[PDB]
Design an enzyme around this catalytic site. Structure first.
Site, PDB file in Angstrom:
ATOM      1  N   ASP A   1       1.069  -1.106  -0.073  1.00 26.70           N
ATOM      2  CA  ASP A   1      -0.285   0.038   0.005  1.00 26.70           C
ATOM      3  C   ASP A   1       0.949   1.433  -0.168  1.00 26.70           C
ATOM      4  O   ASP A   1       2.199   1.704   0.573  1.00 26.70           O
ATOM      5  CB  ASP A   1      -1.014  -0.650   1.285  1.00 26.70           C
ATOM      6  CG  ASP A   1      -1.700   0.570   1.986  1.00 26.70           C
ATOM      7  OD1 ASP A   1      -2.063   1.932   1.290  1.00 26.70           O
ATOM      8  OD2 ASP A   1      -0.926   2.105   2.676  1.00 26.70           O
TER       9      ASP A   1
ATOM     10  N   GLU B   1       0.649  -0.724  -5.059  1.00 31.55           N
ATOM     11  CA  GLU B   1      -0.132   0.524  -5.166  1.00 31.55           C
ATOM     12  C   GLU B   1       0.625   1.707  -4.783  1.00 31.55           C
ATOM     13  O   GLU B   1       0.904   1.624  -3.921  1.00 31.55           O
ATOM     14  CB  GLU B   1      -1.804   0.443  -3.949  1.00 31.55           C
ATOM     15  CG  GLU B   1      -2.392   1.703  -4.698  1.00 31.55           C
ATOM     16  CD  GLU B   1      -1.452   3.390  -3.638  1.00 31.55           C
ATOM     17  OE1 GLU B   1      -1.378   2.709  -1.741  1.00 31.55           O
ATOM     18  OE2 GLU B   1      -1.465   4.370  -3.783  1.00 31.55           O
TER      19      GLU B   1
END
Ligand SMILES: [Mg+2]
Ligand SMILES: [Mg+2]
Ligand SMILES: [Mg+2]
Ligand SMILES: [Mg+2]
Length: 755
Positions: free
Chosen positions: A430, A483
């Site tokens: 993330d 991401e």
């Protein structure tokens, strides 16, 4: 080796097989060394030594007995290798069982860790059950180079460390062997810093931990707790390219999927434990164990037809409300859900059911909790000392010093650890931007540029590249997903081409475009047709994963139904149109728990999902819709073989903005697998709508999101349509279709149909 020595091994007469098995130096040359690796592999017909970091592989030869193997290799250092073992038609790849002949750190272990290159450091740091001086016990070791003293405190010494003071090796690592204790020992490190301040730390390399909010580490005999059954899964993974397969991910937060009753014990794999209450405000609820999740989540996901489960971070973390993103026990799966062997059982059962496991992995920072990595030895050891690069002040967390060898080693070996010991099939990282930029969330004058004057965090880029290089070398057919929300280039490209080495990247632009689009009243979508089509313009610059994640159904953004305009029927129809489009658009797929049954409320990490909704037809129909869509996805090669090639997609027409209609082809290797996809993103039905197609013949209506079993109106083409020889959209043939309201059709030529 002689036949006498071989036979001593074969017949278990040898006094110490480590003298002969494993890796042994034979001689030293001027610029290299000659080594032999030996293995006794009963039932194997053939074997190889793989040196994955050098991209080499050498056959082993049988020597004196068909199941005793030797391999001679010349190289300066033979630190990293695996055995590939073939038993009949099947191959497995393992680490050498005879790799480490003592539990203690060797000089070679210390040297490699000092350089940041000890890929298996977790075999020697932490706590390991072993034998020293002929006595069984636990060996402890911890990196704390500036501590004045370190002692092991625990249950075994009533938390008094005075007779368990550690010994400092090579000015860097402290060790201790403690006889006659074993697995299940509860302990901490008691450190005195250079100022004389005494404090307590959990084991950075600990394998198990008390339940939050307690923080002691717990000794685990990690190689002797679980028997795996997933060799065939692992072999297929290694020998396959996941980029060319269907990848449909069910994203799950383990703490909040389903809760149980706190009035009963938490069952484990052959045993039980006290229940873990979810919160003091909901005290009748407890977490499910990894065991119970294996028994309930796995068949749920298998019945839904997803290929993979992606877990929000399972590494040990002290606060539920972080969702797992603030980790303090990097080497242990959280004890919220039971023991390490319960999580092994979970992964093994996924594999048995043909489901892969992707872990959210969090290398970007760590919180300040006193038990954790912060200020570990009385200096900024894990985190960089300069707050301008060492703190994420807006988050209140600390940033690893990626340039420091032992810190880099902790994290690189950590990623490998989860593939090695827990058999996982991928990772997702993330907020990769948080690592990549020296000015991330920092004000002018409160960061400093890199040595070249730029904003790139060079040490972090180097670390990310190293992680991806190694992961794919040791475990070739995994998923490494990023991401990255700043348009950093070549995220999902090979390191040798200047990429960061991931193999998939979340298409955040796509996600924004889609959710913003569907939130628009349908009359107005004609002013935003570009939201439908724009993401194909840059699509081939990365390998994209189409993800609708947990982050999109929290903080006032609503759950999926709630985002959609219109009456209840139309909200459902919009959800089915969006996800049909998602599953037909090029790219792999991820969606979060609750999206598949139309939960109305936002995800709440402190409760469980609203399962009672599945008593009612509209939610059942939506769940059947997803079940059928996942089944279609795995059955139709054109939805997954050529995602990342031009061949795999072509717009038919995307100009009809005024009616919010678009259409496109998907292709695969066989031309008869091509699919025609038509999308109607208003509630206006069309009785006759012409779409260009490439061939004559009958086009079966393979899928129709307005089908009645999905909650739709049941409008459509009653089985399919014969193409007309009527040029349209620059194609020689065309179908005259009925387009249902707020719906997507998938059609497919049946070249064997009777005319
Ligand atoms: Mg004391
Ligand atoms: Mg974010
Ligand atoms: Mg716009
Ligand atoms: Mg509930």
């Amino acid at each position: 080796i002689s036949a006498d020595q071989v036979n001593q091994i074969i017949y278990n007469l040898h006094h110490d097989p480590f003298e002969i098995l494993g890796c042994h130096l034979l001689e030293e040359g001027k610029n290299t060394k000659k080594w032999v690796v030996r293995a006794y592999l009963p039932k194997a017909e053939a074997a190889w030594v793989i040196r994955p970091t050098e991209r080499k592989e050498d056959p082993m030869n049988s020597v004196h007995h068909p199941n005793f193997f030797e391999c001679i290799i010349e190289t300066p250092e033979l630190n990293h290798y695996q055995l590939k073992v073939k038993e009949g038609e099947h191959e497995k790849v393992i680490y050498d069982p005879y790799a480490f002949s003592s539990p203690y750190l060797t000089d070679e272990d210390i040297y490699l860790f000092s350089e940041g290159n000890h890929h298996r450091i977790y075999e020697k740091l932490g706590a390991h059950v072993g034998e020293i001086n002929g006595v069984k016990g636990v060996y402890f070791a911890v990196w704390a180079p500036n501590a004045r003293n370190v002692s092991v405190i625990g249950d075994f010494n009533n938390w008094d460390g005075r007779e368990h003071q550690m010994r400092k090796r090579n000015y860097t690592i402290w060790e201790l062997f403690v006889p006659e204790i074993g697995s299940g020992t509860v302990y901490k490190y008691e450190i005195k810093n250079s100022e004389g301040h005494i404090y307590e730390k959990s084991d950075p390399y600990g394998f198990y931990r008390e339940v939050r909010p307690n923080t002691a580490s717990i000794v685990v005999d990690i190689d002797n707790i679980y028997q795996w059954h997933d060799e065939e899964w692992l072999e297929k993974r290694r020998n396959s390219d996941p980029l060319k397969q269907p990848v449909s991910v069910y994203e799950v937060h383990l703490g909040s999927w389903l809760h149980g009753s706190s009035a009963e014990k938490m069952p484990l794999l052959n045993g039980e434990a006290d229940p873990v209450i979810v919160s003091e405000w909901n005290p009748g609820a407890r977490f499910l164990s990894y065991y119970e999740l294996a028994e309930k989540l796995i068949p749920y996901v298998k019945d839904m037809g997803y290929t993979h489960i992606e877990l929000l971070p399972i590494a040990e973390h002290p606060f539920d409300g972080s969702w797992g993103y603030q980790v303090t026990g990097f080497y242990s799966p959280t004890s919220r859900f039971g023991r390490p062997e319960d999580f092994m059982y979970f992964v093994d059962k996924c594999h048995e059911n043909g489901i892969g496991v992707i872990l959210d992995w969090v290398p970007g920072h760590f919180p300040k909790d006193s038990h954790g990595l912060a200020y570990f030895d009385g200096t900024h050891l894990y985190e960089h000392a300069d707050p301008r690069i060492g703190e994420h002040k807006e988050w209140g967390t600390l940033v690893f010093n990626y340039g420091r060898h032992e810190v880099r080693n902790f994290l690189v070996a950590n990623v490998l650890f989860w593939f090695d010991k827990y058999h996982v099939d991928g990772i997702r990282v993330d907020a990769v931007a948080s690592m990549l930029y020296r000015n991330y969330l920092r004000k002018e004058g409160e960061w400093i540029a890199n040595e070249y004057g730029g904003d790139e965090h060079i040490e972090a880029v180097s670390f990310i590249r190293e992680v991806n290089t190694l992961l794919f070398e040791y475990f070739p057919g995994i998923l490494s997903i990023a991401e990255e929300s700043t348009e950093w280039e070549k995220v999902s490209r090979p390191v040798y081409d200047g990429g960061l080495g991931f193999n998939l990247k979340w298409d955040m632009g796509w996600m924004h475009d889609m959710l913003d689009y569907f939130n628009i009243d349908p009359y107005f979508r004609q002013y935003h047709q570009n939201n439908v089509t724009f993401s194909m313009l840059y699509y081939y610059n990365e390998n994209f994963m189409l993800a609708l994640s947990h982050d999109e159904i929290v903080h006032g953004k609503s759950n999926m139904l709630g985002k959609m305009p219109g009456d209840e029927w139309q909200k459902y129809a919009n959800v089915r149109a969006l996800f049909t489009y998602m599953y037909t658009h090029p790219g792999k797929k991820t969606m979060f728990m609750s999206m598949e049954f139309g939960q109305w409320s936002e995800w709440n990490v402190w409760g469980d999902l609203e399962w009672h909704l599945l008593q009612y037809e509209p939610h059942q129909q939506l769940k059947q819709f997803f079940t059928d869509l996942n089944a279609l996805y795995q059955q139709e090669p054109a939805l997954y073989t050529h995602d990342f090639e031009y061949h795999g997609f072509e717009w038919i027409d995307c100009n009809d903005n005024t009616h919010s209609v678009v259409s496109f082809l998907r292709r695969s290797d066989d031309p008869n697998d091509s699919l025609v996809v038509v999308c109607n993103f208003t509630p206006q039905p069309h009785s006759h709508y012409r779409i260009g197609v490439p061939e004559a013949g009958y086009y079966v209506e393979l899928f129709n999101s307005d089908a009645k079993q999905y909650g739709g109106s049941n409008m459509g083409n009653l089985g399919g349509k014969w193409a007309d020889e009527w040029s349209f959209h620059n194609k020689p043939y065309s179908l005259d279709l009925c387009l249902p309201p707020l719906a997507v059709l998938i059609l497919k030529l049946d070249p064997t149909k009777v005319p």
